[PDB]
Every structure is written in C-alpha cells, then in structure tokens.
Amino acid sequence: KLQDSLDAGVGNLVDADLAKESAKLQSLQTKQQLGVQALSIANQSSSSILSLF
Amino acid sequence: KLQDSLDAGVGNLVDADLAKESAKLQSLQTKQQLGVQALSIANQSSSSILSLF
Amino acid sequence: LNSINTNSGALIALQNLNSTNAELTQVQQRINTGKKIGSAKDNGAIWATAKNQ
Amino acid sequence: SATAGSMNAVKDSLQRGQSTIDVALAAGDTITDLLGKMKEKALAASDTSLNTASFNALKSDFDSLRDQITKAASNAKFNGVSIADGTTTKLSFLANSDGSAFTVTAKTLTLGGLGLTATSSFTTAAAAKTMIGTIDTALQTATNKLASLGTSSTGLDTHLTFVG
Amino acid sequence: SATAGSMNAVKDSLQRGQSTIDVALAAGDTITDLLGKMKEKALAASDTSLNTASFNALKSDFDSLRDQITKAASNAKFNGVSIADGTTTKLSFLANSDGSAFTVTAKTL
Amino acid sequence: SATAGSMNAVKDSLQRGQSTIDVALAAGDTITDLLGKMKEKALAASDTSLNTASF
C-alpha cells in the first residue's frame, strides 16, 4: 500500500492534465495561423509607396 | 474552481474580440489604398502651371 | 516612417509568432510525454523531488 | 549598427551552452537510473537471510552498474567540452556585446563528484547496510546537480530571447 | 525656417526615449516572470510537511532566480543609458526647439 | 464618440461582478453540502438509544 501511495504521489507531482492541453492546442494552432497572416500583412507595407513614384 | 475563475477574469480583462478586428482590418486596408491614391493626387498638383509658361 | 530600409512591424510580428511557436512546442511536449515537468528544465525542485520519490 | 550586428555571436554562445547542458542532462538521466538500480542491489544485499551466491551475484551487478556510471559520465561531452565530466570548474558564455560572461557552474557527475570511488562496493551485510545510505546521498546530490543545470538552461533561454 | 528645421532633433530625442523605454519594458517582463516563479517557490517552501531535501531544492531555485533578476536588471540598457538600471534618477528629452525637457522619472528594477 | 468609448469600463465592471458572484456561488455550494452533513449528524445524534461514544 505504501508503494502504491508513493507512485500516486509522483503522479500527482509530475503528470499533466491533457484535457486542458487539447483546448490549448486548438487555440494555439489558430493563433499561429493568425500570426502568420499578420506577419504577411506586415511584409506587404513597403510596396505602397512605389505607386507614388 | 477559483483558479479557473481568476484565469477567466484575466481573459475578460485583456483578451481582444477578433471578429471586430477582421472588419476593421478590411476597412482600414481599403482606407490605406485610398489614402495613397489621394496622396499621389496631391503630389500631382505642381505640374499644372508648367503649361502656363 | 515610410522607410524601405527597415520594417519594425515585421520584427514585432515575428516576435509574436516566435512566442506562439514556443507555446506550441511546450504544448506538443506536454502532449507527447504526458508530463508537465518531464525534465529538470521545466522545474528543478519538483523534478528532483519526484525523482527521489 | 555595429553593436547591433555583434549580437549574433552572443546568441550563438547561448545556443552552444544550451546544447552542452542538454547532453549533460541526458547523461544525468542515465546516471540516475544506474544509481537507482545500485540502490536496489545494495538494499537486496543488506538482508542477512541470503546465501553467499545471491550476495555475490548482487555485488557483481553492483560493480557492473558502478562501472557503467563511470563510462556514462565519461561520454558526456559536446564538441569536446563538458559541464558534467568534471574537467573544468565552470563555463562562461557571452551575455552582451561588450563581452560580459554568463557564468554556469560545473556539476561533476563522475563517481568522485557523487562521493563514490571506483573501488567502492561491499562484502558484508553491514557494509551493504551502510552502502544503502551512501547510494541515498549519491542519488540525492546527483538530482540536485541536474536541477541546477536545468535552471541554468532556462536562464540561457530567457537571456537569448532578451538579446533578440 | 530655422525653427522648423530644428524640430528634427526633438523628434530624434523622442524616438530615443521610446527605444529606451522599450528595452526597459522587455527587462521588466522578464523580471516579472522571475518574481512570479519566486513567489511559487517561497509559497511551496512555506508548507511544514516538506522534508529537508525539497526545502533545500526550493531554496536553491529561489537563489538562482534571485540572481537572474540581478542580471536581467543589469542588462537593460539602450546604448549605455538606462531608465531602469538605477544608475540615474531621471532622463530628460527634448520637447520643443527652445530646449524644454520632457522629463521621464527613472523606475529602478 | 467619447460616450460610445466610455462603455468599455461599464462592461468591465459588469464582468467583474459576474466573476465575484461566481466565486460566491461556489462557496455557497460547499456550505450547502456542509450544512446537509451537519443536519444528518444532528438528526443521528438526536436518538436516545445511541450510546455515549457514538454521540
């Protein structure tokens, strides 16, 4: 019983809660796509002044 | 439960509403191209009096 | 402003995208090992305590 | 512009230090597993009910893991430089363009850094009973050293982001 | 025309102050994450039920984070001047062509 | 436009009140379960046939 309690304590110490990691993965992939699009919009800025010349 | 409530409060405090940001990005890109065209029309003005001489 | 030699907005957007990619790497490690403290880099005290336990 | 272009060497030094600590952490994982199996062997040897043959096989497995810790500590190097082999007291890494160092104290993982010696073993049940606590202290100091290297690696990562 | 052409130095001073405050804000973000981890370590060490080894490990990580705060505060400079290093009480910046200051009080970190 | 931009603080205070009421509802659920256990304990103790130790 004591060895089972020690293994349970190690699992309480280090194990992660995957149910939150799933929603975190969804939100972070969506945020990556949005950040890539924002980075491309930042890349586009230089071209606008070529029309002035 | 208190930890989840505090995280929800931080999200209420600082998170943005992206659905407004999409329409704002569309209208502001259109306004930026229109501003570049108006600035070019402002650049043109000096040329008209060269024909007077 | 209106520079062609530098683009600070692309630098800030790349910083934000790098932070998002780091968060995705963290979530990917927590998913593929199942531990929120899978190494000493995550948290040395709790990791050493779990190792001794 | 020159000071801004000088930061690439600093980022390279921080990445090199992170790689060295990564190799040292892998060797430390191996050494901790070997220390745990050695505590298993010593605790099994401590019992007085065993016949001589089981005690001899246990001391032989204990000597085998003790040699494995030596070689595993010997192989912990990254491009000929190490933070865990015990060759040097510390490693300094670039922290800014002016040349300020980021000190990283070395943490020896060889048997001599664990308080053990190459000849160390046991031949009687009382010697195994003392070796139980000896391996306890050795595994404890090894985990403390590994935690220190992990904190140093997290500091290298944060300073790299700040330099960028 | 001279008063109009002198404004570029004022604009340069304001951009210089903005860059210095940006570097200080990055160092402050790092210092805040370090302070939060030290809160977690001290709050974990406060529990009576821990054995001596966990308390010693929490003390070691706390000391390491305390040294990291010193380094992150030391490195917060923009070309040799800093608003957060604590080497000066305040930085002044141009506000107009006549030389009026735009005072920015230092915030030691 | 100033009055239209003024509403963000109102929405923030509204959300803060919602969060405070949520924490209060969690504490009330806990207090309700505790009150039910205490009612069961008192109702069990009310019987006279019980011996002193169980009381």
From Swiss-Prot, chain F:
Location within or outside the cell: Secreted; Bacterial flagellum
What does the organism's lineage look like at the top? Bacteria, Pseudomonadati, Pseudomonadota, Alphaproteobacteria, Caulobacterales
Subunit-structure text: In C.crescentus, the flagellar filament is composed of multiple flagellins of 29 kDa; 27 kDa and 25 kDa.
> Would you tell me the protein name for this molecule?
Flagellin FljM
Positions spanned in the full protein: 56 to 110 of 273
Superkingdom field: Bacteria
Disulphide bonds annotated for this chain are none
Describe the function of this protein.
Flagellin is the subunit protein which polymerizes to form the filaments of bacterial flagella.
Extract the coiled-coil ranges from the record: none
> Which family does the record claim for this protein?
Belongs to the bacterial flagellin family.
